[PDB]
Design a binder for this molecule. Structure first.
Ligand SMILES: *[C@@H]1O[C@H](CO)[C@@H](O)[C@H](O)[C@H]1NC(C)=O
Ligand SMILES: *[C@@H]1O[C@H](CO)[C@@H](O)[C@H](O)[C@H]1NC(C)=O
Ligand SMILES: *[C@@H]1O[C@H](CO)[C@@H](O)[C@H](O)[C@H]1NC(C)=O
Ligand SMILES: *[C@@H]1O[C@H](CO)[C@@H](O)[C@H](O)[C@H]1NC(C)=O
Ligand SMILES: [Cl-]
Ligand SMILES: [Zn+2]
Lengths: 597, 49
């Protein structure tokens, strides 16, 4: 009769074929990543190409289906996701051109090697050369030279290519009814078809600006403390009121400030949270780590894992006989096949990452009943949020006390708590302002308000304002520093970290309130709290089948994002920083720069 | 429709063999009867044969 049952039956067929197709693709990917051989690469390529061809076929088939007005909450969302083809909405020639330009900056960023001036034949890639130099060599001159080399050797070849990339992305967005490619990425967060819970695309900008405005004093105090500590370390390289150099942030771009902690620890003589020797003494192995993690999720209210995972997954290093990329990854292969790759050592890093991986598998399992196009999170920042909240909950020392992973005489004190909060701030909080700066710059560039000849002529001003960092070496328009990161050069979004951090803090506060936790938020554990586990699993099972705000309210009860859990969690850090910064200037000065005296 | 099977599939998808029994208790001449297993044949003792 009408188009309702027509679309229903077409989507049933699409689900039936896509389950098997993604099953084959994921099986090939798992074979490749666990076994680095040319045949495995060819199999992965064939599987991916076949899946892309089938997606093209399904989009073509669904194109004749009229938009009309259908509000089943599944079929409309599925056809909307299938319709946004993107690269294929323009002509074939323009698609080939954008593929060429995409591979252009991809290869340029991958092979942006820098060679030492004293030895032309000695060249280093981004890994492990620049990473090791950044994380180990604390010399000011070497870090500055590495920053200069990385942002000089690569940006010149990228500037006009990124110009054409921005133009083409704007073209694709405008052809698909988005004002800019930024609006295309907003469309994921767009909420419509529900009464009383609608979310506008400008509401994202409004909420982001409001949240960053509230966060600004926290970043100001943290940056002032870092400036004071590094000026104590570097008397003649940092102004008392000026902005910190780009290479004195703990990394190369400003993404994470972890390496500053060793130079900015309040009490370094006190021990740091590390129980590697404990698991070494107890003769632990990675299978025991996974068993303990499954037991912990049983305690918090999750059912145990099936035998298929333990028969199929790999939980340790397979050696070089069949090579494997040891980046810990999860797979929902389809047809109830769940797996994880991880080269597990007896470490706390591996412990936390393993909780992320297996709780991330559990999150994937939560929406098993949802159809194929609904086998995803409500927004781009829920799976990482679940992983991070599980890591934070399992990282609490009391959680280790119950299972005997550390000596009970640790005697949690104020100094250790402040050290842990500072590590969190320089690891989790330390990325929020930089992420906001980069995402705002990308938004304003895509929207067309930033002239090309002035692109960085805006960035390095706002860097003196938002991030509070002044460029150490002047650059002309040839260089392309703002686009010298992984996300921009690999065609991925960047707001996911900010959204994930906000969501993870809200989720942790909700679980703690549902767990009858008393005291500071950082000393909160969800173990043996099935109520909070089920309350969060209510969100987990929803997936993307429903708008993200309803899922958010289902656990926290708040329809809009807010930073109140951030204040509740970091209040001791706020008080300590305010007490310490009584005789130091708060804020950064835009006029100061190392290269001008 | 194709009705194949695989061993990787979990509980609920592995193939099962099922058989049925149709009876009739309507009053009719009896054909299929049970032997009521067996008992040892006692002798020279008042019993219930
Ligand atoms: C690994 O790959 C090689 C070549 O592609 C293949 O011969 C071998 O069987 C693979 N290993 C496994 C366990 O399948
Ligand atoms: C939406 O479609 C599904 C699939 O047929 C159906 O089970 C459900 O009842 C529909 N919802 C409404 C509100 O009709
Ligand atoms: C999971 O728990 C159920 C409940 O008793 C049990 O029957 C099953 O054997 C458990 N599975 C594993 C792999 O331990
Ligand atoms: C949770 O309960 C188990 C069993 O009742 C117990 O062994 C464990 O110590 C408890 N953990 C906490 C943090 O109370
Ligand atoms: Cl930059
Ligand atoms: Zn994960």
């Amino acid at each position: 009769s009408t188009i309702e049952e027509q679309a229903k039956t077409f989507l049933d067929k699409f689900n039936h074929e896509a389950e098997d197709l993604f099953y084959q693709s994921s099986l090939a990917s798992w074979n490749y990543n666990t076994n680095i051989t040319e045949e495995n690469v060819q199999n992965m390529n064939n599987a991916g190409d076949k899946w892309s061809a089938f997606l093209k076929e399904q989009s073509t088939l669904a194109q004749m289906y009229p938009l009309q007005e259908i509000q089943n909450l599944t079929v409309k969302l599925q056809l909307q996701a299938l319709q946004q083809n993107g690269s294929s909405v323009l002509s074939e020639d323009k698609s080939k051109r954008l593929n060429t330009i995409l591979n252009t900056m991809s290869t340029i960023y991958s092979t942006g090697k820098v060679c030492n001036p004293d030895n032309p034949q000695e060249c280093l890639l981004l890994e492990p050369g620049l990473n090791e130099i950044m994380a180990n060599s604390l010399d000011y001159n070497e870090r500055l030279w590495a920053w200069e080399s990385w942002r000089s050797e690569v940006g010149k070849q990228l500037r006009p290519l990124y110009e054409e990339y921005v133009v083409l992305k704007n073209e694709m967005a405008r052809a698909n009814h988005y004002e800019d490619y930024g609006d295309y990425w907003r469309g994921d967060y767009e909420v419509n078809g529900v009464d009383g819970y609608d979310y506008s695309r400008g509401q994202l900008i409004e909420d982001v600006e409001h949240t960053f405005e509230e966060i600004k004093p926290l970043y100001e105090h943290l940056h002032a403390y870092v400036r004071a500590k590094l000026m104590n370390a570097y008397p003649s390289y940092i102004s008392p009121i000026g902005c910190l150099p780009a290479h004195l942030l703990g990394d190369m771009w400003g993404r994470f400030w972890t390496n500053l902690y060793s130079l900015t620890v309040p009490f370094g003589q006190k021990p740091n949270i590390d129980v590697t020797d404990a698991m070494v003494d107890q003769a632990w192995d990675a299978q025991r780590i996974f068993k303990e993690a499954e037991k912990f999720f049983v305690s918090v209210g999750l059912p145990n894992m099936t035998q298929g995972f333990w028969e199929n997954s790999m939980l340790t290093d397979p050696g070089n006989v069949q090579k494997a990329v040891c980046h810990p990854t999860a797979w929902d292969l389809g047809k109830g096949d769940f797996r994880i790759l991880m080269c597990t050592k007896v470490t706390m890093d591996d412990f936390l990452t393993a909780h992320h991986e297996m709780g991330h598998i559990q999150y994937d399992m939560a929406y098993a009943a949802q159809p194929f196009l609904l086998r995803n999170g409500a927004n781009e920042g829920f799976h990482e949020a679940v992983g991070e909240i599980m890591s934070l909950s399992a990282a609490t020392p009391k959680h280790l006390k119950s299972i005997g992973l550390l000596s009970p005489d640790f005697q949690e004190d104020n100094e250790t708590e402040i050290n842990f909060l500072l590590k969190q701030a320089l690891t989790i909080v330390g990325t929020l302002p930089f992420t906001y700066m980069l995402e705002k710059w990308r938004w304003m560039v895509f929207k067309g308000e930033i002239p090309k000849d002035q692109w960085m002529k805006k960035w390095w001003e706002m860097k003196r304002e938002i991030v509070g960092v002044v460029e150490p070496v002047p650059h002309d328009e040839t260089y392309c520093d703002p686009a010298s990161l992984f996300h921009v050069s690999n065609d991925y979004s960047f707001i996911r970290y900010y959204t994930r951090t906000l969501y993870q803090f809200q989720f942790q506060e909700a679980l703690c309130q549902a767990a009858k936790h008393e005291g500071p938020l950082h000393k909160c554990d969800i173990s043996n709290s099935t109520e909070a586990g089920q309350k969060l699993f209510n969100m987990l099972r929803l997936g993307k089948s429903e708008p993200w705000t309803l899922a958010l309210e289902n656990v926290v009860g708040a329809k809009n994002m807010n930073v109140r859990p951030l204040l509740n969690y970091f209040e001791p850090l706020f008080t300590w920083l305010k007490d310490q910064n009584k005789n130091s200037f708060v804020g950064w000065s835009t006029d100061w720069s190392p290269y001008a005296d | 429709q194709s009705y194949g099977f695989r061993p990787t599939y979990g509980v609920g998808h592995q193939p099962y063999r099922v058989v049925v029994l149709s009876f009739e208790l309507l009053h009719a001449p009896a054909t299929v009867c049970g032997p009521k297993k067996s008992t040892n044949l006692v002798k020279n003792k008042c019993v219930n044969f």
